[PDB]
């Protein structure tokens, strides 16, 4: 019941106890194991905010203090009339570092105590959340030297008014659907593109559009927002070899900010709550660029490249795969935007997992998600067994809004 | 209950059914996934019950479910049991019971080819000499001079405990490894600790990167003893790079036949604790693993060297690129040489043609994704974009704890 976790590249072996405070269940269970699945009241609200209040005190080491019960007695008299509460702003900082900390799938998480924390609780309109936004966006950029951030809008109600980000990520590409049959720009945001038209959007219909911002406030219909170009940091992608890179006509952004995620707090439901970092090299390179869902290019490249392409077994779309990853890194490198390789981070968070076995009695870890989509084995996550479980506060999915929303 | 898994770069969606006829548990909870973890004297009591549903099982698939040769079968069956506390497969029985443990290996991306399996019935084996020419014969056959056949030979079955058949290799070929004074390892160091305990029972090592082990043999609970495979019998692939000359320089080379020995063959209740199997390889288990495991051969850094690099920084890829080369050179070798060989990309395209096959025809296809999806270059082969459902059935193939920590030793 004490569950040991060993690296079998190194015999390093970790004892994990934390998973003993796990209370939200895997999706798996003694006859079937679920791991590479995807997605698998009053009376309820008042334990959940005794278990928060219960770890935040503990955390500042006032466990059992007069502070500790006041505050219990205050949110517990507060539950029982208002029917909800509100967090104290120190709660809801350790809140949403915590919900990082927790966030299992998560390979940047050694970073978790120094996000910045934004309290847009007090946002009412769609123009507000804009402001809110773009001013995450220009802190969060800092003129490449990237900085973690969250933005938190007012917590769900009565399910009514909820306050949504309609973008799937603040920074997205346009995504057309060709007469011609295929597709232009960025498949996985096909859909979201056709809403942002339907909602009267002026389309470009480039290949790298950047798309306009689609803000819900209090429940309303969402509103269009244009983000300031002069915000939004972009990279032209280049090759530190390879001179007709450029002609290819690549480009990325800087700023992954997720922004349709649920933030959940004792309870509580952050519905809008965009936050962001800064990008592995491979999510843009790997996932971005060569999913063949996605951007797709790596015929064209390995084309430019003169690799035979006739058999799978010359390696071809590997041999390209690492090229293209390699300028991404090169190119943000070159621009001063702050970027991580999979090498690094991997070798980043097996230290975060070390602290945390012997600071916090273990870290909850989903390894499917952890190792890289690339040269998984040569990264020291591949050897490392890990325990994955659901620690609160959390971030969670959440359904897309226009299957919802009451318009 | 019904369970879906959807491909995400696709849109498939399958429905498993075959869940339910699981039994063995996973070693996850409600509230724990193992989905990562490596690993998470049988009584007529229990014994039974799991040769009822294997007879079960068995004539279904022959559409003899119910007749009079099942329930005889059942009741030949029941009388051996209690009366002689085990029972005897037969030969239909063994040869279905094999290709099922291999086709219920949720851990194995081959499994398109699981109902190719080449049965060698060695259950009257009685020596280690006898093991050793049941063995021979396998790897001759498996062979085959380059265009590799899958085989698995099958020796007598666990009784009391205390007269297992064991083979002590892990696998039938494997290179030596020597810990050298200086705290280096020549050769393969997974591999030290059996070249020691081989080297220890009278083994008069070459001393060389790439010496092939002698087999350890354990027949009736006997101490084990060493022979040597005619190297005539070893087919071997010098490894070279199609574009790098200077590749071949690097000494390398590699054997044809994979042969996995130590695992346990559990049919109907039945235990086989000797069973080696082989089929053939899959490009990245030699060239990522193999050759690039920081705690393998580890040649990253030699041949990123050669390719002069930039090696000072990781964010330059230098281990990404020489890595695909490494594996680049290591299909070329097998090909050249006509011995069959597949890629990563290849053999996770049909993995999901026979998944899907699979749940069309059976209800489901057992599959574990940490072990399915290529060491290398994951999300661009379609395994990786597929959700899977990992559940445990029988026959199936099963670790053991290694003999040398079990064995009473003779003298
Ligand atoms: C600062 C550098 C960061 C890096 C390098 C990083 C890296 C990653 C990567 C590579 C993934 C894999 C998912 C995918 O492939 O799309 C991921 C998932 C995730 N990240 Fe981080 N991240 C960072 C910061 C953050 C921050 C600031 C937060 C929130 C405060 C966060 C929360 C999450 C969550 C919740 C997931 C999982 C979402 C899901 O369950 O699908 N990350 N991260
Ligand atoms: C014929 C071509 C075959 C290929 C290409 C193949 C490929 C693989 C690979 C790549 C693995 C992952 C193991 C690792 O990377 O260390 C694996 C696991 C496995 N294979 Fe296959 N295999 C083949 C044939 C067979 C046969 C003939 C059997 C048995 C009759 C078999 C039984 C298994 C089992 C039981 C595992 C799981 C091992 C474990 O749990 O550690 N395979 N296979
Ligand atoms: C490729 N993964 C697919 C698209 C699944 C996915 C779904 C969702 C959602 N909802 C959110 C997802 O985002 C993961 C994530 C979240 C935050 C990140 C931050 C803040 C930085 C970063 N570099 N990567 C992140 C990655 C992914
Ligand atoms: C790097 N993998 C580590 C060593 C774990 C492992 C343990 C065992 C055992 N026992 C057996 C293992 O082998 C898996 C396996 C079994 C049979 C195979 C066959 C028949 C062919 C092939 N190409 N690969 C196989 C791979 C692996
Ligand atoms: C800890 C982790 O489960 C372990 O390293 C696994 C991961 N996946 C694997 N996958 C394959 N094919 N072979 C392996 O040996 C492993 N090792
Ligand atoms: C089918 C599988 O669960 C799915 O492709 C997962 C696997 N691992 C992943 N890992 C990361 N980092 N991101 C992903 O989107 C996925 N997708
Ligand atoms: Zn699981």
Redesign the interface.
Known sequence: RF?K??N??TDVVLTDTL?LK?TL??????????????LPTKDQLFPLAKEFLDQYYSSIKRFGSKAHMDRLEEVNKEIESTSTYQLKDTELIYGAKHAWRNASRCVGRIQWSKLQVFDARDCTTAHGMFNYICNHVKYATNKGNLRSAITIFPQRTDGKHDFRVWNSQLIRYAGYKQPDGSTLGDPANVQFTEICIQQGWKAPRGRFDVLPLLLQANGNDPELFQIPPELVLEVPIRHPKFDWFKDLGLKWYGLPAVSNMLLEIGGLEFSACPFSGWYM?TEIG??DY????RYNI?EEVAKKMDLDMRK????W???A??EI??AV?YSF?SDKVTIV?H??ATESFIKHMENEYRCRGGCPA???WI????????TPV?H??????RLTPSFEYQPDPWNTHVW
């Open positions: 569950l976790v060993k079998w590249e998973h796990s269940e895997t999706g798996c269970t003694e006859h079937i194991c679920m791991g590479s699945i995807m090299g790997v996932r060569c999913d063949n869902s790596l799978t077994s010359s390696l779309k590997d041999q795969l690492v990853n390699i890194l490198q390789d090498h690094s989903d390894w499917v190792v890289p989509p690339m040269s998984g084995s040569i591949f490392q067994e890990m325990l994955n479980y």
